[PDB]
Structure formats: C-alpha cells, structure tokens
Chains A and B, each alone.
Chain A
Amino acid sequence: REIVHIQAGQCGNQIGAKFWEVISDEHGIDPTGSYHGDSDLQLERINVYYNEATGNKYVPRAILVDLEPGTMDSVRSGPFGQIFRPDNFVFGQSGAGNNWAKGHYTEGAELVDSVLDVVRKESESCDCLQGFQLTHSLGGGTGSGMGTLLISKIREEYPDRIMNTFSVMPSPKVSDTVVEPYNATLSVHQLVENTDETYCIDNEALYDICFRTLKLTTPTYGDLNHLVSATMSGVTTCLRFPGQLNADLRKLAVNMVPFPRLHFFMPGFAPLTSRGSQYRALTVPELTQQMFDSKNMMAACDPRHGRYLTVAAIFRGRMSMKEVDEQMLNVQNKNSSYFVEWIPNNVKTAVCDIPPGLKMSATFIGNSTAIQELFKRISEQFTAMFRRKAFLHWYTGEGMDEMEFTEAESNMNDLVSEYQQYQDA
C-alpha cells in the first residue's frame, strides 16, 4: 500500500525535506539510501513511503516541485538531499511571486504537465496505490496555487484514490506578504472540494507555541519546522509501522471524516520540544493532559470553543497500555461535553513501541468544530482587503475574475457555518 508524496513551493519543500530526514532516521535509512537499522518492525512497511532500487537502496517516493530553483537547490545540498530521485526534482525558473493566480493559472500551468509525468511514473510502479500526500503552505504562490492545481489534476487522473495534505496556514505573526489571506482563501476553497483529509498546520499556533510555551523569543522558520516535522512523524506513525488503527489513508478518512467537507484536522503533540532541549520522560498521565491542551494544538483554535467530532490519539514508546486507556478514558469523562454525544466512541487510541528523539511521545489528531476559528480568522483578513479590492490587480492581471474571489469567500463562509451547525447539534 504505497503513498506518493508531493512537496510544492518553499514551505512545502522545507517541511517536506524535514519530514523525510525525520522518518529516514526512524526507519534506519542513511543519506545514501542504505538501511542500517537495529529493528525490522523499520522495514516491515517501508514500501508505504520508499521504493526499492538496484543495490538494496530505499528511495523516497517523493516528488519535489517548485517554480524557483532556490529552495530545491538548498534541499539537494542538505543532509538527506542525495536520498531523493534526481529525476523527481521538477522545477521552473520564474518563481510565483507569492501569487496564487501565478501558481494556479499562468506559471504553474506551464510546469504542471511535467510534474504529472513524474506522478504517473511513480504511480505505474505501485502494486496498490492508496493515494497522495501533499506538503505545502496556503499563503505563498507555488505551494498554494500550483499545489491546489496539482491536486485538481491528480484527482481527475486518480478519482478513486485518497488525497491527503499537510497545509500550512498563514498568519500575520509569521508573514511573507499582505496577500496571504487571498492565497489561503483561494486554496481552502480548492481543499474543501478536492481533498479527503487535510492536516491544518497553523503558523500562528506554531509561533505562539515557540514564543509563549518554549519561550523562544524571536522564533525562526527552523523553530516552526521542528514542531511540524515532529507532528508529521506522529500523525503518519500508523501508516509506517505495523498497526490496527488508521493503518491506511482510507481507513483514517472513514474514521475521521463524518461529513465530506469537514476534513480539516487539528494536530497536537507532546512533549513540546525545542531544538536541543534538556532529563525527564513524561508520565502517561502527563502526555495525555498536554496533548489535549489548547497550548499543544498545531492550529490556533481553542478546543473548548467547539466540540470534537472524532479524535485519533497515538502514543509512542514503551509504556503501560492499561495506564494509556485509563488516561484516555479520563480525559473524555472529565470533558464529555466537548465530544459530540451523537458519535459513539469517537476517540480511538493507538500505541507504537518505537519512539521518535524522545523516550515517549503522544500525537493528537482532532476533527474539532473549533477549527472554524482558523477559517474565521482568514475570512476576516480576506474580507478586510476584498471589501476595498486591495491588491486585486496582481490577481486580475493574471486572468482571474472577481467572481472567483466571491465564490472562494462564500465557500469558506459556508464551511464555517457547517462546522457551527454540528457544534450546536
């Protein structure tokens, strides 16, 4: 059961490169692609993310996309840069200028067919393809515009497969341009229609965690990417190691998505580490309380402001399964109002013996109605500019029409009202 990984744009390639470095270490794969691990329980499901090449080499089933060579040249030089298939680097020369329209309609449309040729080649060499996972940001131009363009084209060619994304939401606290609410709203509109599951990784939440919790006053993208790669590792553990719960993308979607449009997940992680941090190993009760706390959410939403439709918890490392079950049952009994009563047993728990890194950790995946706070924040920012048609010339100049913006704004407002409807049920 193979997954085809695609990473697009600066953010998509930076978080994507970290994800591959992290899991390559976990699976005992070195930068040359050779296996040198101390367990085989690393190679049991290695084929989910890696292909097997000539001299017993494991090659990531990853496709690196960007309209600018810069970020991809940085990857090719980084630690695990040589692990990727050289043919799978697909890049243009004229970037996207943080413009969704350029990535989706003009610059991106010129490069998209060559990317699909690589996607097709990777798919044809799959015994049984489960689907695709895309890493990207929604505030830029390549990952946002060209990424959603790729999703649309892939869906047309593989309508019966799962489309999963790790989508980095933009925030004024960690911003590159004022047009981020435009790019994000346009991308969310695409995501609501063409993805089965999206992990909402909020830069606002990643910033507040680094600043308020870790006390990293003046955090860098590297600091935010430390949390991201750790969360990405946790949420994909069930797909990379032998397990019974959410072992593939489809079963995960069936367990987590009660309504087709409501597929935006709020990840959580514990303990919150800081690059090069100190000594203790968090008890099971401590892991559980933290992963459910607003301060550990990777989306800037207060779960106490909504209700959980479904939840998937994953514990990693050697620990008491009896204690895990007691702690998991306790969080629900102590906060039963924040879990919808009309979805019985909506909190599932998995445990993996192999820890990340750390001695023991816990990853949370929640489909909460509080996620509307993220879409409300973006919608507010989008409307503040769209109301006065600010910066629209950059988009209309690429061929886009104002009607397209009105539809994206409306679809996202509908998404918010749908999340609110199920919160009042």
Chain B
Amino acid sequence: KREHEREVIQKAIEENNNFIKMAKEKLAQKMESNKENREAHLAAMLERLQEKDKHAEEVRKNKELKEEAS
C-alpha cells in the first residue's frame, strides 16, 4: 500500500510537469510559426511591390528606346 501511495503522488507530479512541459513547447511553436507566417505575408507583399518597380524601370527604358529610334 505504501508502494501505491508513492506511485499516486509521483503520477500526479509526472502529469502536471508533463502538462506544463507540453504547453510551454506548443506555445513557443505557435508563436514561432505565427511569426513565420506573418513575415511571409509581408515578404510576398513586398515581392509583389518590387516586381511592380522592376516593371516601371522597364517602362521608362521602353520610352528611352522609342525616343532614340524616332
């Protein structure tokens, strides 16, 4: 019976500690994966805007070509 009394209290510790452990790791994983997702959304947004600038440089150059071949 003393053997079981020690198994009960150790089971309670192992469960609370393991719960605290999992929650800590899952929260850090969520905050990290969120950071990655938000930064990816901004990176794609800026990539789209940059592709638009590259196109404006190509338009200004396309005018430079037409003016010289006039």
A residues engaging B (CB < 8 A)? 101, 105-106, 109, 149, 152, 156, 397-401
Contacts and interface: CB of A to CB of B under 8 A. Distances in A.
B1 A399 contact: no
Interface in B1-42: 1-2, 5, 7-12, 15
Nearest to B6: A109
Interface of B: 1-2, 5, 7-12, 15
24 contacts: A101-B8, A105-B5, A105-B8, A105-B9, A105-B12, A106-B9, A106-B12, A109-B5, A109-B9, A149-B5, A152-B1, A156-B2, A397-B12, A398-B8, A398-B12, A399-B7, A399-B8, A399-B9, A399-B10, A399-B11, A399-B12, A399-B15, A400-B8, A401-B11
Nearest to A155: B1
Contacts of B12: 105-106, 397-399
Q: Classify the interface of chain B: helix, strand, loop or mixed.
A: helix
Contacts of B9: 105-106, 109, 399
A90 B8 CA distance: 24
Nearest to A400: B8
Nearest to B14: A399
A131 to B, nearest CB: 20
Contacts of A401: 11
Contacts of A105: 5, 8-9, 12
A371 B9 CA distance: 34
Given A105-B5, A399-B8, A399-B11, 5 more contacts: A106-B9, A106-B12, A109-B9, A156-B2, A398-B8
A149 B10 CA distance: 17
Select the residue from B2, B8, B10 with max chain A CB neighbours within 10 A: B8
Contacts of A400: 8
Contacts of B5: 105, 109, 149
A101 B8 CA distance: 9
Contacts of B7: 399
Nearest to B11: A399
A103 to B, nearest CB: 12
A183 to B, nearest CB: 16
Nearest to B15: A399
Nearest to B1: A152
